[PDB]
Amino acid sequence: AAVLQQVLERTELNKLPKSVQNKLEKFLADQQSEIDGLKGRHEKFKVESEQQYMEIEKRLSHSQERLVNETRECQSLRLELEKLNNQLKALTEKNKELEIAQDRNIAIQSQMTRTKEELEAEKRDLIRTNERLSQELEYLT
Amino acid sequence: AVLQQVLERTELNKLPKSVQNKLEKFLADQQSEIDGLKGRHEKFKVESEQQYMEIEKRLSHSQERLVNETRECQSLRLELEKLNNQLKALTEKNKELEIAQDRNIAIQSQMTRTKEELEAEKRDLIRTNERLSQELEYLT
């Protein structure tokens, strides 16, 4: 599993001191490990990124759909508001002309009460005159 | 270049030139591969974050507009509720006005009766008072 026997031959590898071989293999090993470590790290990031991207793309999809519905509800409300505002305007007009009618009746009834009291007063005067003439008639008989 | 990072000066000069070239080439190939992986990862990271950043703005923009639309919709129901209560209360009031109007006419026809009746009593009062006057004349 040695990296050094790959690069050099058996004749020139054996010409290297133990110490020297140990240093080279140590460093060549570390380079092999970093390569695999980088490739390992890249995949962990890759799956994490793609995973996060899917889920936030999901949220957008839901948001879009919710907006479409809300916009549709707004428009439905605006229509029934417009229809009811016309309903109300006509109901106000009908009301304020019923107000007019009420005041007319209140005026009429108040006036006819005024006349009643006039007929009342005039009757009292004729009655008072009546009894006075009645009494003057009792002297002359 | 690279053979200096592995071995000290006095022991690396003890290696033949062909051996030095063979190690040096290999060491460089691996470092070239490492720096390649690092470059690869850095650019992928930068693309990955930008792609996420963009759609995040797209969501943020969409959620803001969902908030705007929800408020308007809520306020629209609000307007429609107050308006429905106006209608309801006005129908009730109009109903009562109609009933009062009908009742008022009944009263007016009643007051007319009392008027005619009083005028008839007054007319008779004038008749008896004239009769009484001419009778006084006769007696004095």
C-alpha span between B101 and A100 (Å, rounded): 11
In residues, how long is chain A? 141
Q: How many CB atoms lie within 10 A of CB A48?
A: 11
Residue B78 CA to chain centroid, in angstroms?
A: 9
Least CA distance to A112: which residue of chain B? B111
The answer to whether B67 faces chain A, any CB pair under 8 Å, is no
Q: Do B94 and A98 form a contact (C-beta atoms < 8 A)? A: yes
C-alpha span between A112 and A106 (Å, rounded): 10
Which method resolved this structure? X-ray
Q: Which residues 6+ apart lie within 8 Å of A140 measured at CB?
A: B136, B139, B140
Least CA distance to B78: which residue of chain A? A77
- What is the number of domains present in chain A? 1
* Integer angstrom CA distances of residue A27 from A32, B33, B103: 9, 15, 113
* Full residue range of the structural domain in which residue A19 is found: 1-141
Residue B93: its H or E element: helix B17-139
In A, which residues are within 8 Å of B97 by CB distance? 95, 98-99, 101-102
In A, which residues are within 8 Å of B34 by CB distance? 31, 34-35, 38
The answer to whether B75 faces chain A, any CB pair under 8 Å, is no
CA atoms in the 13 A half-sphere facing the CB of A96:
6
Quote the tokens at residue B132: 């009484």
Q: Do B125 and A119 form a contact (C-beta atoms < 8 A)? A: no
